[PDB]
Amino acid sequence: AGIWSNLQSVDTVPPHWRSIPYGRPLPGQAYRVVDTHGRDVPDLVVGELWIGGASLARGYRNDPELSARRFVHDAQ
């Protein structure tokens, strides 16, 4: 993501947190939570986190192949 993709401000902790969550995705960037098939999973449904948008690093430098596994492209 470069340095980050979220800002959960924490003025105070509400009692329903079980960990401090990733907040709203930062300006210019985004998250999806996704199935093994990459289709986005519903709210509260646990899935893999994908980061997107204008904060993404390019890839793993001299490794293009891990970059094609760990970075993916969708209509989104």
Partner: protein, 516 residues
């Protein structure tokens, strides 16, 4: 004779829900009863009282006592079979609010099966001239198809006890002494298949939880309900036939797609009750007893396939695991626990989709079609059932309150209904893939939409301007010494010139290996 009055063993799945009364059992502490609420206008409580205790005296299974993991039948139980609440005496809104107290209690109730009370009819006669004829049946006594047999017998016993055709004589214990031992070769022959798969069976459907399933002392079931129209039903049925698949396979496939989409895993166990009739007596479709066997359907729900593929696939998986169902889901999950792997199917797909109407015609005529219902199935987070209602279809999701996040089974069901009529209203060569519930995806498009505040520039551009603006301003402080912006900038630009001198040029890479 495993004689009609002797104590006899619980049939497989009867053990499962019997143990589901255990207060420490996983999401236990509850009956496994269906509660039905009908509405009708004005119906004789004396006919109803007489009908309830008629069908108890006609059908030994409705007067079965349950103790010690076995069933022993009371010739007549100590406890009354009809809860008449003749509230034509009350005012209407008091009767409604007090009906809510009775409703919640009776519909969540652990029925007194130790005292022969598997079956409990009742009636609140609401002073609005509405007889809320209702029916708590512990499914310990009966298969849900056998619950529509109870309704068939009750409808006749209310209308005309003269028309009650026969005492259906094959005793349920004699059927178990038959059918369980008859299937026992197929139980072992399937136990092989299951045993050899116990590591390779999927998990429980990994839906989201606001309480883990052992960690609530009473699963208060909440029903969620949708009557698919007669026309939506027709479109599902035409498409079901056009794809060569049973309507139950369609609703099952669709449910498995929803559950998949809401699970952490697209592969999981869900339980299917099979309302078995393979004993040779034609009255086995007439005895009011728990002929269910429970099937552990290991469904596996790919993305990207059309729904037509996903349902043909789900049907093969259902029809194939039906062969293996002669070893019961109960004993498979015990076998997984004996292998030290705590698998379960804590979600159920009960497709009561015989063609006649779920409430049989006699009972529909006597009172009304089903108005509301609840299933108190233990160890089950989400008891999804289906019922023909009119020539339409009721989709029931008997969720558990508080187990799920609040609004989740509502949302996940509104997405299930949306899918099932996306299956009415668009041909199944469409992707099996659901939409998200749009309100969720719209929220997420806002989150992901937040504008790039990026004044997009090379990463140093600010600093070399901040340096030109205030060269003396402090940029770095160290153990005592400090570097001004101008100093850091001039130092960095000397290094930069040193790097062009060293043959480094833009976008080529430079290790930096310096103490802080």
């Amino acid at each position: 004779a495993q004689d009609r009055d002797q104590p006899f063993e619980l049939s497989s799945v009867q053990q499962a829900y019997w143990l589901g009364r255990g207060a420490g059992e996983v999401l236990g502490n509850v009956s496994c009863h269906a509660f039905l609420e009908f509405r009708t206008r004005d119906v004789d409580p004396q006919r109803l009282a007489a009908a309830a205790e008629c069908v108890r005296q006609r059908h030994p299974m409705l007067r079965a006592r349950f103790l010690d993991g076995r069933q022993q039948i009371l010739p007549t139980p100590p406890l009354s079979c009809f809860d008449l609440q003749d509230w034509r005496t009350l005012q209407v809104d008091e009767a409604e609010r007090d009906w809510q107290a009775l409703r919640d209690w009776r519909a969540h109730e652990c029925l007194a099966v130790e005292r022969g009370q598997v079956f409990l009819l009742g009636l609140v006669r609401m002073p609005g001239g509405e007889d809320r004829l209702w029916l708590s049946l512990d499914l310990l006594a009966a298969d849900v198809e056998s619950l529509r047999l109870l309704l068939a017998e009750l409808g006749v016993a209310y209308l005309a006890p003269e028309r009650l055709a026969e005492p259906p004589a094959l005793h349920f214990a004699d059927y178990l002494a038959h059918r369980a031992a008859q299937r026992a070769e197929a139980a072992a022959r399937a136990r092989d298949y299951w045993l050899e798969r116990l590591p390779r069976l999927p998990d429980a459907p990994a839906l989201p939880l606001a309480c883990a399933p052992e960690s609530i002392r009473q699963p208060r079931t909440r029903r969620l309900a949708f009557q698919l129209s007669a026309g939506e039903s027709r479109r599902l049925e035409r498409l079901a036939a056009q794809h060569g698949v049973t309507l139950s396979s369609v609703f099952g496939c669709a449910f498995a797609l929803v559950l998949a989409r809401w699970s952490e895993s697209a592969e999981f166990l869900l339980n299917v009750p099979l309302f078995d009739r393979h004993a040779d007596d034609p009255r086995i479709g007439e005895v009011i007893a728990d002929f269910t066997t429970l099937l552990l359907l290991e469904c596996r729900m790919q993305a990207g396939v059309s729904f037509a593929e996903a349902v043909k696939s789900f049907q093969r998986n259902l029809h194939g695991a039906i062969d293996h169902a002669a070893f019961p889901a109960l004993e498979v999950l015990r076998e997984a626990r004996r292998q030290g792997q705590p698998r379960s199917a804590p979600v159920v797909f009960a497709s009561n989709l015989g063609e006649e109407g779920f409430v049989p015609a006699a009972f529909r005529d006597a009172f009304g079609d089903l108005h509301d219902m609840l299933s108190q199935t233990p160890q089950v987070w989400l008891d999804h059932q289906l019922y023909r209602v009119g020539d339409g279809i009721l989709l029931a999701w008997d969720s558990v309150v508080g187990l799920f996040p609040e609004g989740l089974p509502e949302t996940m069901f509104e997405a299930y209904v949306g899918l099932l009529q996306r299956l009415c209203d668009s041909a199944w060569g469409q992707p099996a893939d659901l939409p998200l519930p749009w309100a969720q995806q719209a929220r997420r498009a806002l989150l992901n939409g937040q504008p790039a505040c990026a004044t997009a520039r090379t990463l140093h551009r600010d600093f070399f301007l901040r340096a030109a603006e205030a060269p003396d301003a402090d940029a770095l402080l160290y153990r005592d010494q400090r570097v001004t912006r101008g100093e850091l900038a001039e130092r960095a630009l000397r290094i930069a010139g040193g790097l062009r001198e060293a043959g480094v040029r833009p976008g080529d890479a430079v290790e930096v290996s310096l103490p802080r």
